[PDB]
Design a protein around this ligand. Structure first.
Ligand SMILES: Cc1cc2nc3c(=O)[nH]c(=O)nc-3n(C[C@H](O)[C@H](O)[C@H](O)COP(=O)(O)OP(=O)(O)OC[C@H]3O[C@@H](n4cnc5c(N)ncnc54)[C@H](O)[C@@H]3O)c2cc1C
Ligand SMILES: Cc1cc2nc3c(=O)[nH]c(=O)nc-3n(C[C@H](O)[C@H](O)[C@H](O)COP(=O)(O)OP(=O)(O)OC[C@H]3O[C@@H](n4cnc5c(N)ncnc54)[C@H](O)[C@@H]3O)c2cc1C
Ligand SMILES: O=C(O)CCc1cc2c(-c3ccccc3)cc(=O)oc2cc1O
Ligand SMILES: O=C(O)CCc1cc2c(-c3ccccc3)cc(=O)oc2cc1O
Ligand code: NA
Ligand code: NA
Lengths: 322, 322
């Protein structure tokens, strides 16, 4: 078959590779934005879903990454173990992923004292898959397998069909609604700044919806820099860093972790989470040619990508046997 | 009184400051080596004692540091939280410091799989007090209080006495045996290399005495670099980096953590742990003038320093009331 994948973020590339592996075929990746200009490049890269099928896709992804975490290749993947805190106010039940992450537990009283404003929470060990390095890795692997890349903006699936493609794999993310309307797909705008604070060895996530849910400070160490954030604005399309939000993050994070006050700011990026009540991963026969939708991963695309890639490949198989 | 402290490592400076605070006096620090040329500068700086009174001195130190850990000043102290692994073979009982460290526990099966060679171990959250930055901090504080510093090599306590000093506080560390013989004081030579591997967010200590006890690999992340080590050579006085030991560390640590293979080596230092069956913290009236010995902290001087400083100050009081 003649395959075309639309999208060169984590979903698009993970899918293309994951299919190429199951079945070997002419695979072409089309996207209007490649690294470091994708939403994937913005993300801190913490494995952790938000609060039915999806749990297994996440859990598949975790184990897959956990396999690679202690091999020499991991540096090029931008993958590493990291333990950290989740902070709430009222106590709430353990997550679905309790047993998926390494060494999950409830915070002791002594730990909770370190965060004056929060009274209940977790500690666990997870991973970070840094978007930048993962896409370079996925791209180097796809290129090794003769998967050709072209930079171009697709105006319709029909456009791609006329070219002579048997299967279209649509991993356009938040921009999907252009190619086929979907009012369930809303952009959940977020903004982060990358600061220099190497003493930070743990991630810290908070859960305070006073500003609208997910407008609450978080600190997520990376390799070179530390990601500061906590902005989630449904409906905002402004791909522009914003001063009001810049301060909101800075203030929020400084209160959590005062040591951060004298940390040099290295950068700041805006990106859009492709939010949808559930992910859209399903087959579809085009009006005028098969389509696999794989978009709407919200704020957990790196967390869940690999499970989605396999499920897309198993969908790609289901079509090849027709 | 006219006070003189001998030593400008963690013990010497912590003691001088800790006394200046309890009682306010003319305090002078004498030492032949100041930063970054002290044994204190070599140490990774992990809080963790080795395996009766001493437990409380350690525990005093921990809490004292834990107070400072979330204040803005901490960066200048070189102090930060860090979680990590201790790896053994045969299972052994929990340590005295179980309840002192944050969130102590036994490793789950799934965690133990990440270290093929080890079958039992711990996980806990501790701190790192980086020797370099702590001494700059202690020195800036002591200077703020008009504590004058002089670089000079003391040949005898009698030498210092004739100058006209009422109390001598001897924090000479491993070189103490020159000023007063002590065959219980042996140098426990160690060597470490500082590599560049920022993805390392946890410390890892191992316990395999095949090469003599404490000749076993360890990885201890710092702020800017990661400390690699595991050398403990009783009786060796060679202040010289050694190629056989350089490789031993490199090999040992690479087996624990393969990701480390392609990590650029930033530096390498040799230092001597002042080993003694127990610490020598006690008062003594000189032959020809009072002395407080405070030396022999082995591989846990940063871990225990503050408890030792307070106990030395309480000893300094006991003398002032005479
Ligand atoms: C600020 C922020 C922080 C985040 N942090 C985390 C985190 O810590 N952990 C986590 O798991 N997730 C996180 N996420 C979520 C994660 O970043 C996204 O879910 C993920 O990057 C989406 O992957 P994607 O491939 O669907 O989208 P994208 O990475 O946006 O890729 C979309 C691709 O499709 C292409 N494309 C789209 N439309 C067209 C078209 N019409 N024609 C041609 N090409 C097209 C684009 O050029 C691009 O190549 C975060 C998101 C944001 C915004
Ligand atoms: C390789 C290595 C790694 C380590 N890692 C850790 C760790 O992770 N955590 C931890 O808690 N501990 C660690 N330690 C232990 C710690 O480094 C020491 O216990 C501690 O630094 C000793 O402090 P000190 O002030 O006694 O000695 P030093 O720091 O050696 O200071 C001694 C001072 O006395 C002066 N002096 C000595 N004799 C004389 C004299 N005759 N005249 C004038 N001045 C004199 C010296 O100039 C110097 O200023 C480590 C040690 C080594 C060697
Ligand atoms: O999506 C992101 O911006 C970061 C990744 C991430 C975030 C959460 C958040 C969250 C979001 C915004 C502000 C505060 C907390 C809550 C949550 O429950 O899960 C998350 C998982 C993630 O991977
Ligand atoms: O003293 C040092 O060199 C590091 C600090 C340190 C080490 C231990 C070690 C050790 C020592 C050498 C090789 C492997 C393990 C064993 C141990 O049980 O406790 C330690 C505490 C420390 O602060
Ligand atoms: Na609290
Ligand atoms: Na094991």
């Amino acid at each position: 078959m003649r395959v075309v994948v639309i999208g060169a973020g984590v979903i698009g590339l993970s899918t293309a590779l994951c299919i190429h592996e199951r079945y070997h075929l002419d695979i072409k990746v089309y996207a209007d934005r490649f690294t470091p200009l994708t939403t994937t490049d913005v993300a801190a890269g913490l494995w952790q879903p938000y609060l039915p099928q999806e749990a297994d896709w996440s859990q598949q992804t975790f184990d897959y990454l956990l396999s690679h975490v202690h091999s020499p290749n991991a540096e090029n993947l931008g993958l590493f173990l990291i333990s950290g805190y989740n902070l709430f106010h009222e106590a709430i039940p353990d997550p679905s992923w309790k047993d998926t992450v390494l060494g999950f537990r409830k915070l002791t009283p002594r730990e909770l004292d370190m965060f004056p404003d929060y009274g209940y929470g977790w500690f666990h060990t997870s991973l970070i898959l840094e978007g930048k390095n993962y896409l370079q890795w996925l791209t180097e692997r796809l290129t090794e397998r003769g998967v050709k890349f072209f930079q171009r903006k697709v105006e319709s699936f029909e456009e791609v069909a006329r070219e002579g493609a048997d299967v279209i794999v649509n991993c356009t993310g938040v921009w999907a609604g252009a190619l086929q309307r979907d009012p369930l797909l809303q952009p959940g705008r977020g903004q982060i700044m990358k600061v220099d604070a190497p003493w930070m060895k743990h991630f810290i996530l908070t859960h305070d919806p006073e500003r609208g849910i997910y407008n609450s400070p978080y600190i997520i160490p990376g390799t070179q820099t530390v990601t500061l954030g906590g902005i989630f604005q449904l409906g905002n399309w402004s791909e522009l860093n914003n001063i009001q939000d810049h301060n909101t993050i800075w203030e929020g994070c400084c209160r959590l972790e005062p040591t951060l006050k004298n940390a040099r700011i290295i950068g700041e990026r805006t990106g859009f989470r492709p939010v949808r009540p559930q992910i859209r991963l399903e087959r579809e026969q085009l009006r005028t040619t098969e389509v696999i939708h794989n978009y709407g991963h919200g704020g957990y695309g790196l967390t869940i990508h690999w499970g989605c890639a396999l499920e897309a490949a198993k969908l790609f198989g289901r079509i090849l046997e027709e």
